[PDB]
Amino acid sequence: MSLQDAEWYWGDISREEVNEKLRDTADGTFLVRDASTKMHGDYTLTLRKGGNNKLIKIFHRDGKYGFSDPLTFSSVVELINHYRNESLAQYNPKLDVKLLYPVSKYQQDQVVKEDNIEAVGKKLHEYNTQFQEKSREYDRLYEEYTRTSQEIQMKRTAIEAFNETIKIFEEQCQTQERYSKEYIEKFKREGNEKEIQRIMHNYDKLKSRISEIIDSRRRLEEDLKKQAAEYREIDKRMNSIKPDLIQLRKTRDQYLMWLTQKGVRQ
Amino acid sequence: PPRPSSGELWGIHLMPPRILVECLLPNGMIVTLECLREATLITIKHELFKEARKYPLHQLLQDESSYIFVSVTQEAEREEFFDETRRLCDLRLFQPFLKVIEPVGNREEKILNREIGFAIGMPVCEFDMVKDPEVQDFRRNILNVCKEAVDLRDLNSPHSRAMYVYPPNVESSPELPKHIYNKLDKIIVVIWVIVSPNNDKQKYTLKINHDCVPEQVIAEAIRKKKVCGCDEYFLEKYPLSQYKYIRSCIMLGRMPNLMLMAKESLYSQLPMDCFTMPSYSRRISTKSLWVINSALRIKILCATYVNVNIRDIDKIYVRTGIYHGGEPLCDNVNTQRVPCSNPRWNEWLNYDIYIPDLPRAARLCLSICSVKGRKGAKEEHCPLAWGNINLFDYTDTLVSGKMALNLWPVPHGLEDLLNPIGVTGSNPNKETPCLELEFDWFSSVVKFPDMSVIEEHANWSVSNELRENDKEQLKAISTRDPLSEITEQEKDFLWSHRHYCVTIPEILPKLLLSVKWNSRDEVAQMYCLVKDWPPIKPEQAMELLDCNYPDPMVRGFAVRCLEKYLTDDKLSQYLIQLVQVLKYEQYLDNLLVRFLLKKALTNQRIGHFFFWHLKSEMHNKTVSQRFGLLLESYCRACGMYLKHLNRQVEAMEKLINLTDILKQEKKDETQKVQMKFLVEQMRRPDFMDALQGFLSPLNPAHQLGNLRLEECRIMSSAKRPLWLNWENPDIMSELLFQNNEIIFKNGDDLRQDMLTLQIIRIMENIWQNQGLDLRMLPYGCLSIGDCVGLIEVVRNSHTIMQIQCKQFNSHTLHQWLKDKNKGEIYDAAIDLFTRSCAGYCVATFILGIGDRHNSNIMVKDDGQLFHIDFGHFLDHKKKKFGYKRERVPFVLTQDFLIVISKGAQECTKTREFERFQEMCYKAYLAIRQHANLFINLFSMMLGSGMPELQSFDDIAYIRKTLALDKTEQEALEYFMKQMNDAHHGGWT
Numbered sequence A: 001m002s003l004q005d006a007e008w009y010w011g012d013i014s015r016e017e018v019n020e021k022l023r024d025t026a027d028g029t030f031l032v033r034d035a036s037t038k039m040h041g042d043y044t045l046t047l048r049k050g051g052n053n054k055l056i057k058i059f060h061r062d063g064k065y066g067f068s069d070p071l072t073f074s075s076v077v078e079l080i081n082h083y084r085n086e087s088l089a090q091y092n093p094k095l096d097v098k099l100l101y102p103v104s105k106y107q108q109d110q111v112v113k114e115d116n117i118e119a120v121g122k123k124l125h126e127y128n129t130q131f132q133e134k135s136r137e138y139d140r141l142y143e144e145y146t147r148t149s150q151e152i153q154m155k156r157t158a159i160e161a162f163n164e165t166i167k168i169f170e171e172q173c174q175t176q177e178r179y180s181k182e183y184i185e186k187f188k189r190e191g192n193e194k195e196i197q198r199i200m201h202n203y204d205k206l207k208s209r210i211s212e213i214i215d216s217r218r219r220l221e222e223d224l225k226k227q228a229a230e231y232r233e234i235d236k237r238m239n240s241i242k243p244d245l246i247q248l249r250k251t252r253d254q255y256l257m258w259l260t261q262k263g264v265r266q
Numbered sequence B: 001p002p003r004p005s006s007g008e009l010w011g012i013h014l015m016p017p018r019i020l021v022e023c024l025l026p027n028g029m030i031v032t033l034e035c036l037r038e039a040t041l042i043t044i045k046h047e048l049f050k051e052a053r054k055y056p057l058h059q060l061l062q063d064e065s066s067y068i069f070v071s072v073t074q075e076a077e078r079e080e081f082f083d084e085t086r087r088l089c090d091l092r093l094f095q096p097f098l099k100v101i102e103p104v105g106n107r108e109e110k111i112l113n114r115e116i117g118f119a120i121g122m123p124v125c126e127f128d129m130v131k132d133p134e135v136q137d138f139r140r141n142i143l144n145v146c147k148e149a150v151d152l153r154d155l156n157s158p159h160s161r162a163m164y165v166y167p168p169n170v171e172s173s174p175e176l177p178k179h180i181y182n183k184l185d186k187i188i189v190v191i192w193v194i195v196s197p198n199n200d201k202q203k204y205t206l207k208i209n210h211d212c213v214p215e216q217v218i219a220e221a222i223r224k225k226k227v228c229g230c231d232e233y234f235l236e237k238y239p240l241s242q243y244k245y246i247r248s249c250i251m252l253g254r255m256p257n258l259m260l261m262a263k264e265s266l267y268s269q270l271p272m273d274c275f276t277m278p279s280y281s282r283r284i285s286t287k288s289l290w291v292i293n294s295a296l297r298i299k300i301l302c303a304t305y306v307n308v309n310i311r312d313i314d315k316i317y318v319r320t321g322i323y324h325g326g327e328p329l330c331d332n333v334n335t336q337r338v339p340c341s342n343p344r345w346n347e348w349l350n351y352d353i354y355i356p357d358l359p360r361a362a363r364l365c366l367s368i369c370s371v372k373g374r375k376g377a378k379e380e381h382c383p384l385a386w387g388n389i390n391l392f393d394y395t396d397t398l399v400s401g402k403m404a405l406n407l408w409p410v411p412h413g414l415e416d417l418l419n420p421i422g423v424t425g426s427n428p429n430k431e432t433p434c435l436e437l438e439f440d441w442f443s444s445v446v447k448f449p450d451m452s453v454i455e456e457h458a459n460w461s462v463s464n465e466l467r468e469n470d471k472e473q474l475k476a477i478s479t480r481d482p483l484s485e486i487t488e489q490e491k492d493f494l495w496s497h498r499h500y501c502v503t504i505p506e507i508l509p510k511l512l513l514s515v516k517w518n519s520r521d522e523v524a525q526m527y528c529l530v531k532d533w534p535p536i537k538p539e540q541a542m543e544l545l546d547c548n549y550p551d552p553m554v555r556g557f558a559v560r561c562l563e564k565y566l567t568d569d570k571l572s573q574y575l576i577q578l579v580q581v582l583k584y585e586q587y588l589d590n591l592l593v594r595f596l597l598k599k600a601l602t603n604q605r606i607g608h609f610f611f612w613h614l615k616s617e618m619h620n621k622t623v624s625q626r627f628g629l630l631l632e633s634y635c636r637a638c639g640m641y642l643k644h645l646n647r648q649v650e651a652m653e654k655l656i657n658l659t660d661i662l663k664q665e666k667k668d669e670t671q672k673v674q675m676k677f678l679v680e681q682m683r684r685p686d687f688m689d690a691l692q693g694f695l696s697p698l699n700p701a702h703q704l705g706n707l708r709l710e711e712c713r714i715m716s717s718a719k720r721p722l723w724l725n726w727e728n729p730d731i732m733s734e735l736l737f738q739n740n741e742i743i744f745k746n747g748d749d750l751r752q753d754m755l756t757l758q759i760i761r762i763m764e765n766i767w768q769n770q771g772l773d774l775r776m777l778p779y780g781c782l783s784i785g786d787c788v789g790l791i792e793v794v795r796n797s798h799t800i801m802q803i804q805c806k807q808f809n810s811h812t813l814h815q816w817l818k819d820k821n822k823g824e825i826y827d828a829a830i831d832l833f834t835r836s837c838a839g840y841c842v843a844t845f846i847l848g849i850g851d852r853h854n855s856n857i858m859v860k861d862d863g864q865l866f867h868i869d870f871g872h873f874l875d876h877k878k879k880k881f882g883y884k885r886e887r888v889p890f891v892l893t894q895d896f897l898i899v900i901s902k903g904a905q906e907c908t909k910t911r912e913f914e915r916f917q918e919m920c921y922k923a924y925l926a927i928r929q930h931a932n933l934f935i936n937l938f939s940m941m942l943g944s945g946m947p948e949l950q951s952f953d954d955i956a957y958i959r960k961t962l963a964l965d966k967t968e969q970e971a972l973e974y975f976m977k978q979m980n981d982a983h984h985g986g987w988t
């Protein structure tokens, strides 16, 4: 039995902390904490069921504990012991689940591996420095991620504009070919050869302008080809730093919490 | 696609004074023509056709008047330039070329679509290319709202159209608070009348009853014989004191210098608006879900690619989940783990939910995750790309067949493997990971059952008994905050007494959370209770519209509560959240968007900020199509204000382009070189035409007339903000404000500033209506684009560090407030400084605003203190340094306390400091009494994208500063202790 020695029991932990401990856990995952009313006389069993965290109040009267009247159990442990081996479907349907998987403060402390308070503060100062450096690395890399993503969108838009421009200039060729075909014939018999040279000079002028616009798009396409590859590598370094940055912050917060709990209070 | 930059050409922010334009004649010839950058298209077309005679085939060219120009814009659009009075530098050309064509088709339809496309930031012709049936059905079926509002607008003479352009700015109630009334003599209004021929004004003072209708005011003006400075008009029979200008003049003192004019002077200046049914309006064996007797299963086929180096990550997998709002209807189901190089699964995922039990708003939330387990027993998962889809389309059809879904990047800060709050649908950027799914087929089209069949199952499932304390426990549950813990025993208790809950309609949100939405029996019964549920206050109905209440009838009830009880003052007050919750709606066509658009089309002051809130997020691809289609419907029916909005938009685009030049091309040049440049383009003709004579986007009742260039300057920040100044062109600018000033910044996100100033204004309204004259200064702040926004300038305001110069003494601030307020005004300046300190000391502590300093705190000449720059709120220091503490951002040092105590030594012991604490306790408890309103306002912003407001855990910070899990005496003890530990004693 024993009281307050329960691995599944925790003191002033917040529901937000229980959520992080029950996030993505399987059905049956549970833990008990003091009620958020902070009255210190009531507790709250948090159970994982169907992807949700169910809050189950543990009412207390006289010396009896239970989920609802009548309250029969003598220790809050005895209430957890009972349902750790039996199902909660009897207390309420839509449960069909027992208190099978328990979040334990033993594996909670498994992070802080220091004994003397000086070692925890010395280690906390190490992880803090590492975390700030890793965060500044992530924030700068995220700025390149956003700028590269924005510039890629601009290039894709300008490439669309090049496509529409080249279409119009190519329409100008087909329009000139239609109108010239019978007018270069009218000048051939009338011996206006110099006028034909004028039409041919403007056509070369048109094809030369088109050839420039096609090359400007081709240079922007290979630019987009490089920058889309730079974005892909930035994206990978993001997904590599992200998970390590999370656990580095979690390790930091665990050492800071140890220091508060081992220090003087209230 | 929308415009990349805002320059006059692609890659060129400003054309040279002369530029060569390739002109493509209709006969095939190309003519290079030199044009002035500001030359109109009438001039260019005339010079081109005179020059065209020197080129072959000129006989084929028709008359010049028979042609117009076409070119490619920076939006990659093939725009026809029908308005030939436009300058070359204003066409937003991609390249400097122009094509000559004959104009074909509908000139009116094409000109209007050009103006709508320019206003919303993207050509409306892109909406035509969208094959999505819901998009086209939305563009067609939304014209119902457009047709009605224009009919009601012109229904009544020229008065109904005046109610649109100049709506009354009135409070939600004429009931005058006790402390504001005691400022009356059991009201003196000075009416100035422009009497021809000189049109000068004679001062006429009148002492009249406050509840006198505006007509009763002109009655006394005639017997004795519009707000001056802005375009606010008292055109409805609301009590005069109910108008927000009059109500403000009583509390602040000063005389409501109003103005009287003739109706024919304004009705005639009002143009007639007409909605023209567009060119897309005239264009193009089921089973019930409760008959399918099988479980839900979805087949994850394969994905194209993911971006992750294989050396750092082990495997990848597709994580899925069936969600109803923020909660899962069943346990999340993962696929098997595969190598990153072979994103193939071809695997059915079996979900623990009966298909008929699927609620109407059931959604599939999925993502591709990388799982890596190289360290310890714990393996790290990281979301790589996410995607959500509605298991029912907008026609109540259950999704069947195969589906391709392009996924979204994981938003910054999101650490969950799934993004249930994210928007639904595919990523339009097809250069992203694409996941292929397959939904099951059931021999026919599966539809959601009709509401007649819903009430059938509810009447079968349902087929006095209360206790005194049980009724008291129900009342206690309804009074809790929306994020308070609800136990499973309290859920069963609420669901057991659902019918008595009707007696207390405010318990409905807590009751909806007690419903098993994965069970159609309780869900169908809940439908019948909300159908006849009595309506709640609008502030409580807004909660039923955030991310936790996705059901249509739940949201339909909330919209119907706003339709009958949400005043135009409150709708304009909470419009920010009301626009944001549109992102949560499953479909484009919903009752909420119709209510907002209908309200935006019948009230222009509402329609103004309705436009800019949507326009400010068109860059965001997650909502750009929803907000673009909604803005298209608005711009078609808003009437003449589309012209005024385009004046505002083009004015902003020039400021954006100018600031872009200073931050990139001219960043390494000195302040003097940037200013001579700054004035130069300001003296250009196009700049003045666009930057003058337009309504202020911060307040459309403010006319920004002529610029005062000598008072405009570049501020000393890295983003180079622009401190601008316009003259007030009103006939009596001296009565309200002369020389209007606005700060334009392009570079920093102003949504947190915009949100905080909204909350500050909302807090002040709570205090004033409950007898607390705590005067905040919630100046105007509007986000107009991606990290682009406007800022109202408070006149005659100075920072604390400016005061501490003209080093300084602890009494410097107190002596300045006495030198600027010598004699009798001193006793009122101290009162103003004291009541403004209490308001900001309480507000900044509750919200956790970024730390204050001698540059974050400003004081007006009359003593009004206020804060600026609210770039951080809530627990912004949580992730940086994991300290679990509530900061006091505004610590009243010795400088401020000396002022409050009128220069009394030992300031923590005077009668003025005790009354200063009394207002803080009155303010703290007042906001704590309205804690549910503030929780819901922050809850409605959760999907916006603001960094410090991503999860409900972020909102839990105000639950600590307000101490909601304690008693009222316990919380006030907490507030005193926090004020004590911050000021090192004195608060007892």
Ligand SMILES: C[C@H]1OC(=O)N(c2cc(-c3cnc(N)nc3C(F)(F)F)nc(N3CCOCC3)n2)[C@H]1CO
Pocket (backbone or CB within 6 Å): B715, B717, B721, B743, B745, B750, B753, B779, B791, B792, B793, B794, B795, B797, B798, B799, B858, B868, B869, B870
């Ligand atoms: C000494 C000056 O140098 C500044 O930067 N000043 C500012 C800054 C800001 C501001 C606020 N918030 C955000 N986000 N940005 C900005 C910024 F971009 F303009 F700097 N606002 C004002 N106000 C607006 C309210 O009315 C009074 C003037 N003055 C001046 C203060 O006196």
